[PDB]
Ligand binder design. Structure first.
Ligand SMILES: [Mg+2]
Lengths: 143, 122, 258, 164
RNA sequence: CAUCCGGUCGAUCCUGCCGGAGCGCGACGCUCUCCCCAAGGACGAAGCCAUGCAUGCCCGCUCACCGGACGCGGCGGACGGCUCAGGACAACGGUUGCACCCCCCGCGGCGGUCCUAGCCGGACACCGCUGGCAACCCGGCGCCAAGACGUGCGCG
RNA sequence: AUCCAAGGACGGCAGCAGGCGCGGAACUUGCCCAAUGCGCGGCGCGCGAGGCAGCGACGGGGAGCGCGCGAGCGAGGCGGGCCCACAGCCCCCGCCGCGGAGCCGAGGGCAAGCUGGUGCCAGCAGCCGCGGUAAUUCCAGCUCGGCGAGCGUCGCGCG
């Protein structure tokens, strides 16, 4: 038929699948290697960096808001990223030139929501979880 | 006082070690026994009260049944040879010198190895 | 690559037919070289400690053996790792116990008690004939023993009876169709039967077809076929006569014993 | 290495693939109230065991009747089920197994057997009594609510002699 | 132990992707009554290492001090333990062979040796006296043992 | 890389503990050969192999914060046994007897709704979307649901 089907045709089928399975975006992104060399976290759950600028970013057209984020530089790479601290009033707990831990959003490496070109989240600052600081479980009187 | 009745199971003669192999079970439904000491008389009856050793005593859930071991020797000399030391120490057969830390012994051995010729000084 | 020979043995790497508990320890005894090899032997301590139960530890077995309380083929052995093999004589005079080491149907070593009349000899399998120094004919066996000046009528794969006191041959059984045999290797260890056929292939193995007393037939290679007489066994054999029951009958027997 | 590395271990239960399902929640709560179960891990355990038995029965049933393996395995499975009281004695065919259900497993629990003997007022009372060690099986005190009683021990379950 | 659901339109059917729903491996965060089992600096740093421990035993040789020291000699230290850098018809897994091979302990045999044998010769170690050097290290003189070394009695 | 009375001498933890650096990420500078074995050896020595203990929510398994109109049992403490190379631990026996639930969510997918604030700001939201004066979606209180001594978030693999 369209596909070869003879009893001595295993080699051709193997080669066909080998060539054709590179056309899937997911399979390429996983098994090609470019993404790993381009991802600032090099396949890690989260990274540690230093905040250097506190900035606010406007939202997209159908929304109207200014989201609070900070600029970070990763210790182990020295490159630059933008990480966004979501919880209300949690910008005031983050201070310039502070040690932070930055993780990802739900999606692997795409932008999430109406925030344009942002792919990282702040979770720990100065060794204390932001979620815990927001609930008043602990206090940052060491800084 | 609930009478305690004890048995003997798995009797094997061991002339090589001059002893008898022995599994002893005790039934004490209700109260308990007295530190394995009242049991020696009963075991001796069933098979010298000072020529037996008990070491593997376990009490099951609820305390109704207790199972253990025994070792009956024909002579005290045989018990002195064929027997690990800690058993003798636990029993009232010998006295236990105060043990010394093996760390000090290793340190002394290394120090002595360091010296040459006659090193009995250290 | 190790730079020399091996002296240890992990417990999980030991032979299955030794029946060693997984949780007993990291290590297992390493048998020393002797009459029998590693995979066709069992150390003395295992027999003396984990079966007969006359000892409960390594040390007790060491004392018992160094006090000369076991004789192997008429010779006292003090090595706890000495290897015991098939058709060996195990005598303990202190308790008047005499055993011959054989195979059970399941494929494990067993101790068959014997009498005084038949404990003065053993059966050996001759598998190599060669010329030694000065062209003198020689002969070797499965227990690592050599005899000079054998009878010309004795060929390879035959079976030889030798007095324990004196290593002198008495009579010999030929390898031929119609002779009772006992299987000592593979899937059929412990089975007893009579030879029905012999087929040879040039440059490869020789296959032997045997029939059991009940009519069952089985095959095995000649490297583990042992002759034990002329139509009737020459030595006392286990209570069962080399019959392997099926799983169903074994389960019935287990339930009966339960 | 340490000998503790060769110790085996495994799980005992399975979670549903779709969690929020109204009829399933209702049935599970109903069963929990009827038998007074603590949490929902017990139901998952029961389902796991039932699945194991059903899979064994399926595999055996796929084969021929006169297959030696079929006879061996079916005989063992039936003997176990009968001894445990899960399957009725008068059934001795592998087909009957596939119709079994978790409620049959539950009915053989210690709470259930002592309740049907009128020895306890309620499943909750049975659990409270079991914890305090006022109950025994064959002269031995059992304090595990989920302990399953074999048929031969059904008449041997009584109150602990030493209990107040 | 063979399951789907929400999102392109004014409404409708499709293709097609985005997202959700489960299991496992790790890290982060909150919290934590009792018992049992149990992993634990592997994750582009095979990077760097104070401190302590990880290989000894003893048959032979006692005119040593009062036989125990010490030393010569013998066995062992090539096993065990750690890690996965390097290496892509290699290593490795199954299946052959050496009529192209080597092998300690152990088991069983075998054991004839050309041209002072009531028992041969000389030394060293430990030790004594005298000394060098910050340390590490050794020097010279001197009596003594061997299952140590050398020579060697003998049916090729 | 180390000591030097400056002429000289000396080292190799990817062995057990411990330390620095690195990193998202990982434990005591503990006791013992009694067990399993190895080396030597006749009534034994040694072994950071190995065993025992300590930290330990990687993780797995079993019980519980009540039943009832009054009784009973836990955890916990003080003592005695058993065990242990020495000690704990489990278990048994006596006298007193600390009953403590969190993490997520309530528009749909997806089981689960009442006042007060703010006013496209602050914020939520994996996706669709909410918020420009009732906000069923933000921040709070009440109530409710799921799993449960565990719950949630991030990355990877299978589905
Ligand atoms: Mg000559």
């Amino acid at each position: 038929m369209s596909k070869t089907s003879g009893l001595y045709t295993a080699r051709k089928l193997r080669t066909v699948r080998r060539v054709n399975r590179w056309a899937d975006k997911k399979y390429r992104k996983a098994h090609l290697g470019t993404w790993l060399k381009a991802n600032p976290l090099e396949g890690a759950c989260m990274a540690r960096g230093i905040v250097t600028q506190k900035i606010g970013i406007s939202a997209k057209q159908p929304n109207s808001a200014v989201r609070k984020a900070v600029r970070v530089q990763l210790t182990k790479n020295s490159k630059k990223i933008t990480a966004f601290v979501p919880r209300d009033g949690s910008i005031t707990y983050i201070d310039n030139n502070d040690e932070v831990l930055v993780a990802g959003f739900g999606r692997a490496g795409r932008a999430v929501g109406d925030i344009p070109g942002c792919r990282f989240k702040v979770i720990k600052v100065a060794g204390i979880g932001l979620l815990a600081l927001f609930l008043r479980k602990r206090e940052k009187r060491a800084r | 006082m609930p009478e305690i009745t004890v048995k003997v199971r798995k009797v094997l003669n061991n002339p090589l070690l001059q002893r008898q192999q022995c599994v002893v079970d005790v039934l004490h439904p209700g109260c308990t026994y007295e530190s394995k000491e009242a049991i020696k008389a009963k075991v001796a009856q069933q098979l010298d009260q000072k020529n037996i050793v008990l070491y593997g005593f376990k009490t099951s859930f609820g305390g109704g049944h207790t199972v253990g071991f025994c070792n009956a020797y024909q002579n005290m000399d045989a018990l002195m040879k064929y027997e690990p030391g800690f058993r003798k120490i636990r029993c009232g057969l010998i006295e236990a010198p105060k043990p010394v830390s093996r760390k000090q012994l290793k340190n002394l051995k290394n120090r002595r190895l360091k010296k040459r010729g006659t090193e009995k000084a250290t | 690559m190790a730079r020399g020979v091996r002296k240890h043995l992990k417990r999980l790497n030991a032979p299955k037919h030794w029946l060693l508990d997984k949780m007993g320890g990291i290590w297992a005894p390493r048998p020393t070289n002797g009459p029998h090899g590693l995979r066709e032997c069992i150390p003395l301590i295992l027999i003396l400690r984990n079966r007969l139960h006359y000892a409960n530890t390594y040390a007790e077995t060491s004392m018992i053996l160094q006090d000369k309380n076991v004789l192997i083929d008429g010779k006292p052995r003090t090595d706890p790792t000495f290897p015991v093999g098939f058709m060996d004589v195990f005598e303990i005079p202190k308790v008047h116990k005499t055993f011959r080491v054989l195979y059970d149907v399941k494929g494990r070593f067993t101790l068959v008690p014997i009498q005084s009349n038949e404990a003065g000899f053993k059966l050996c399998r001759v598998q190599k004939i060669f010329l030694g120094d000065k062209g003198m004919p020689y002969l070797s066996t499965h227990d690592a023993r050599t005899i000079r000046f054998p009878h010309p009528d004795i060929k390879t794969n035959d079976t030889i009876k030798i007095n324990l006191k004196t290593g002198k041959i008495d009579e010999w059984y030929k390898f031929d169709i119609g002779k009772i045999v006992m299987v000592t290797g593979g899937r059929n260890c412990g089975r007893i039967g009579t030879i029905q056929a012999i087929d040879k292939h040039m440059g490869s193995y020789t296959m032997i077809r045997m029939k059991d007393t009940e009519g069952t037939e089985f095959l095995t290679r000649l490297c583990n076929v042992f002759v034990i007489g002329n139509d009737s066994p020459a030595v006392a054999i286990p209570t069962t006569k080399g019959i392997r029951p099926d799983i169903i009958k074994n389960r019935e027997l287990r339930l009966r014993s339960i | 290495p340490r000998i503790s590395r060769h110790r085996n271990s495994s799980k005992t239960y399975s979670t549903p693939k779709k969690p929020f399902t109204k009829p399933r929640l209702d049935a599970e709560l109903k069963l929990c109230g009827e038998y007074g179960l603590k949490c929902k891990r017990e139901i998952y355990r029961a389902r796991y065991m039932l699945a194991k038995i059903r899979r064994t029965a399926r595999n055996l049933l796929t084969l021929d009747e006169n297959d030696i393996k079929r006879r061996f395995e079916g005989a063992a499975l039936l003997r176990r089920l009968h001894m445990l009281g899960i399957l009725d004695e008068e059934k001795d065919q592998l087909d009957y197994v596939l119709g079994l259900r978790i409620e049959d497993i539950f009915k053989r629990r210690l709470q259930s057997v002592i309740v049907e003997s009128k020895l306890a007022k309620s499943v909750h009372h049975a659990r409270n009594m079991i914890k305090a060690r006022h109950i025994s099986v064959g002269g031995q005190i059992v304090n595990i609510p989920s302990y399953m009683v074999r048929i031969s021990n059904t008449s041997r379950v009584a109150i602990a002699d030493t209990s107040s």
